[PDB]
């Protein structure tokens, strides 16, 4: 079964400057700004763009060791990034995949908005405990504010 999740938040960073850092160069930043959450983001197969398979390795002590994601779309113009979690972590018998779309839109006051949609494809008709959803919301908040804090500490970075 498919179970749909949505969440919206804001950042003080402009949409373009945030998309360049939080999405395009997120492989570099996430182990650098939030090492307590992500140890490394290995790019197993691909050219960054669609079809790419990243290996996000986690520090030992977190509930999961790693996950492997697949890049589905990188919209450099409208600031969209749809990717799918396909292996590792919560994925297995009771969950097929987690498809995620992140869009960043600019706000008039110079900031930005993050629309975050989660699409959980459960095998059969199993439920999804909030612990997995709560872990994803906390993970998104942690990485967003870490890159945000990095972009505030270095006003030069990413133009």
């Amino acid at each position, epitope marked *: 079964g498919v179970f749909n999740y949505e969440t919206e*938040t804001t950042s*003080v960073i402009p949409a373009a400057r945030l998309f360049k850092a939080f999405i395009l160069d997120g492989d570099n930043l996430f182990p650098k*700004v*939030a*090492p*307590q959450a992500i140890s490394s983001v290995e790019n197993i197969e691909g050219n960054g763009g669609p079809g790419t398979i990243k290996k996000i390795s986690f*520090p030992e*002590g977190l509930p999961f060791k790693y996950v492997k994601d697949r890049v589905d779309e990188v919209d450099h113009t409208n600031f969209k990034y749809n990717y799918s979690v396909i292996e590792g972590g919560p994925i297995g018998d009771t969950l097929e995949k987690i498809s995620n779309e992140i869009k960043i839109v600019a706000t008039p006051d110079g900031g930005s908005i993050l629309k975050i949609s989660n699409k959980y494809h459960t095998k059969g008709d199993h439920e999804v405990k909030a612990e997995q959803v709560k872990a994803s919301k*906390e993970m998104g*908040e*942690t990485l967003l*504010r*870490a890159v945000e*804090s*990095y972009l*505030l*500490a270095h006003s030069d970075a990413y133009n």
Partner: antibody, heavy 115, light 108 residues
Framework: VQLQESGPGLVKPSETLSLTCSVS????????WTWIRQSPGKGLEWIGY???????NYNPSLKSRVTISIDTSKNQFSLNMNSVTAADTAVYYC??????????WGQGTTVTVSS | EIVLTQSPATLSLSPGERATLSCRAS??????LAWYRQKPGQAPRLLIY???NRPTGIPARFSGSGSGTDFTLTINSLESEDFAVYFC?????????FGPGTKVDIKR
């Protein structure tokens, strides 16, 4: 950016420590708002830190009895440590942290746990 | 939690000499070490972040280096105003943890 502690300097054992820190000279968005204490026995100790989005992160040795809250409208954040004992007597620093470390600090307020 | 060890506890140097402080971590903190100075009666001030980089306003006479488990802070041309206790901090794994501190006393 400016931070000022305000809270009781004397807390009786098993009661609740409560501290508040006022942010001025800068937006509530800038830092990871942080609580750090310093005691002779334990040295410098990370209590926890809160984003302006509400996401907290607590030290496991103190997560059992520590809650950190933020009120972005009043430009304030708070620390609440209940069931305090003499092992909680320390100078408490409210502070603002970047991703790389604590960038700005409060003056520090001395809390004594005593009967 | 990752346990940071600082060596030595106390060193006593004349002004103008080079001060070399050491920090050791029970596990690998890749490059995520910070150095703070705490002059008496004051809140600590960050000097080195991510083990070699220097925040804006910290003079060039402070530098850090190291990776893995062994890092060192170096103060070129000590001043009498450099009398303080210097702590190292890892941010690799929560909880972030400090070292016991190295006190730099100024010879006179």
């Amino acid at each position: 950016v400016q931070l000022q502690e305000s809270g009781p300097g004397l807390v009786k054992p098993s009661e609740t420590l409560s501290l508040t820190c006022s942010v001025s000279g800068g937006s509530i968005t800038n830092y990871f708002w942080t609580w750090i204490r310093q005691s002779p026995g334990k040295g410098l100790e990370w209590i926890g830190y809160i984003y302006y989005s509400g996401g907290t992160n607590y030290n496991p040795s103190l997560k059992s009895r520590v809650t950190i809250s933020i009120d972005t409208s009043k430009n304030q954040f708070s620390l609440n440590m209940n069931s305090v004992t003499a092992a909680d007597t320390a100078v408490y620093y409210c502070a603002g942290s970047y991703y790389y470390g604590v960038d700005v600090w409060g003056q520090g307020t001395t809390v004594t746990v005593s009967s | 939690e990752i346990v940071l060890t600082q060596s030595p506890a106390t060193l006593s140097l004349s002004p103008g000499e080079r001060a070399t402080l050491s920090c050791r971590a029970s596990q690998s903190i890749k490059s995520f070490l910070a150095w703070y100075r705490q002059k008496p009666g004051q809140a600590p001030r960050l000097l080195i972040y991510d083990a070699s980089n220097r925040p804006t306003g910290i003079p060039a006479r402070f530098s850090g280096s190291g990776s893995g488990t062994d890092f060192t802070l170096t103060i070129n041309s000590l001043e009498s105003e450099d009398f303080a206790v210097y702590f190292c901090q890892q941010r690799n794994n929560w909880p972030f943890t400090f070292g016991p501190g190295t006190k730099v006393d100024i010879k006179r």
